[PDB]
Structure 1
Amino acid sequence: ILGEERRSLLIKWLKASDTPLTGAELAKRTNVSRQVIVQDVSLLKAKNHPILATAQGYIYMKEANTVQAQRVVACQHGPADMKDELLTLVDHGVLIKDVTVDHPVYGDITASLHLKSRKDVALFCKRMEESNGTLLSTLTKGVHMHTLEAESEAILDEAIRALEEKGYLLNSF
């Protein structure tokens, strides 16, 4: 019952929140470890709760106030340009919803980044440099996809235009 009561609290907190809630925050609210929160959210996902784990924490998926434009963007940059590419997008008010790499073993690998702010980008680059961080490894030579979303198609156009200026787009060939 304690597990069921804890998971009931998680649902309530995720639905009330407008920002991602880290596993560490949820763990401290319920006096468990962050590994236990991983298991709780896994059980809730299997009961068809649209809960998403992002680089900044968990979100309960719900629809927005206004229709947000979306676009799939093919990108490619050097092994040390990732922070600059991500900062370029968030500075245009674009949500970096995910990244996808065409892996030769796993197939398409997609990570739900949900980067929105400069601090999101900085902390994500900080923690991934402090580990192996080879999702964008030597395998695809920098080639990767992004799902971007913004308030309008004109904002996406300008953000993508800024990527091309910096040479971060995959160019037709």
Structure 2
Amino acid sequence: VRQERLKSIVRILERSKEPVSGAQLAEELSVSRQVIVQDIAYLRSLGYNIVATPRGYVLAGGKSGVSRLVAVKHAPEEIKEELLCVVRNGGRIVDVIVEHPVYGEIRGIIDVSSEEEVLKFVNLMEMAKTEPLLTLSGGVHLHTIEAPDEETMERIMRELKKKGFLIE
């Protein structure tokens, strides 16, 4: 019984598009909100990331996995192929790092985890007077890639290599 209420609290937080207050949980699950307040503390000690906000609780992500630095080279027009490559294999492109001979290591935030975000990003970059960091670096540069597991990373690296992006 307690386990079914616990499961239902999570369930409500993954599909609800707005923060859901303790009071709403109590009415939905026919317990007092004081009971809800205990259940939320129990679930966090378990490993769920529920934060309270002025409008109610929200379930947050975290639980990160593996990240690797990958060495690649490609032209400005190959950014879309590369990004879509990583994300379609369940990676996230954290950033780009160029090793600048004068300035040393120059970093750009990317944080691209989905297709929509790849297209938002390529659009911005293809504008006027905006050039990718690899143009400082004669093409060669680094990316920080994140993925759930080491298998997914290899998976991603396989695809990057057979497309011909890896520095090997």
Q: Same fold, TM exceeding 0.5?
A: yes
Out of 138, 163, 171, the position equivalent to 2:160 is: 163
Q: Which deviations, in whole Å up to 9, do the C-alpha atoms of 1:59-99 show, x marking residues without a partner?
A: xxxx9643411111101112311110011001111011111
For residues 134 and 111 of structure 2, what CA distance do their matches in structure 1 show? 21
Answering whether residue 138 of structure 2 is matched by residue 115 of structure 1, we say no
Whether the 8 Å contact between 2:76 and 2:132 is mirrored in structure 1 is no
Counterpart for residue 99 of structure 1: 96
**TM superposition shift of 1:114:** 0.6
2:83 to 86, 105, 112: 86
> Tell me, which stretches of 5 or more residues in structure 1 are unaligned?
1-62
Give the Cα separation in 2 of the matches to 1:158 and 1:116: 16
Structure with the larger helix share: 2
Verify the 8 A CA contact 1:101 1:135 in the aligned structure 2: no
For residues 79 and 112 of structure 1, the distance between their equivalents in structure 2, rounded to whole angstroms, comes to: 16
Aligned residue runs from structure 1 range 19-38, under 5 A: none
TM-score, normalised via structure 2 length: 0.59
User: Which whole-Å CA distance do the structure 2 matches of 1:83 and 1:117 have between them?
Assistant: 12
- Indicate the residue corresponding to 1:153 in structure 2: 150
Task: From the two aligned structures, give the one with the greater strand fraction.
Answer: 2
CA distance in 1, matches of 2:83, 2:101: 24
Q: RMSD in angstroms over aligned alpha carbons? A: 1.8
Measured in 1, the distance between the counterparts of 2:125 and 2:102 equals 21
Name the TM-score, length of structure 1 as normaliser.
Answer: 0.58
1:66 to 47, 63, 66: 63
User: Computing the radius of gyration over CA atoms, which structure comes out larger, 1 or 2?
Assistant: 2
Residue by residue over 1:97-133, the C-alpha shift from the partner in whole angstroms, topping out at 9 and shown as x without a partner, is 1110112333211112110011111111101111323
Q: In the superposition, relative to structure 1, how do residues 124 and 69 fare at CA in structure 2: closer, same or farther (>3 Å)?
A: same
SS in 1 for 2:111: coil
1:27-47 deviation per Cα after TM superposition (whole angstroms, max 9, x unaligned): xxxxxxxxxxxxxxxxxxxxx
Indicate the SS of the match to 2:99. strand
Aligned residues: 109
Unaligned runs of 5+ in 2: 1-59
Letter in 2 for 1:94: G
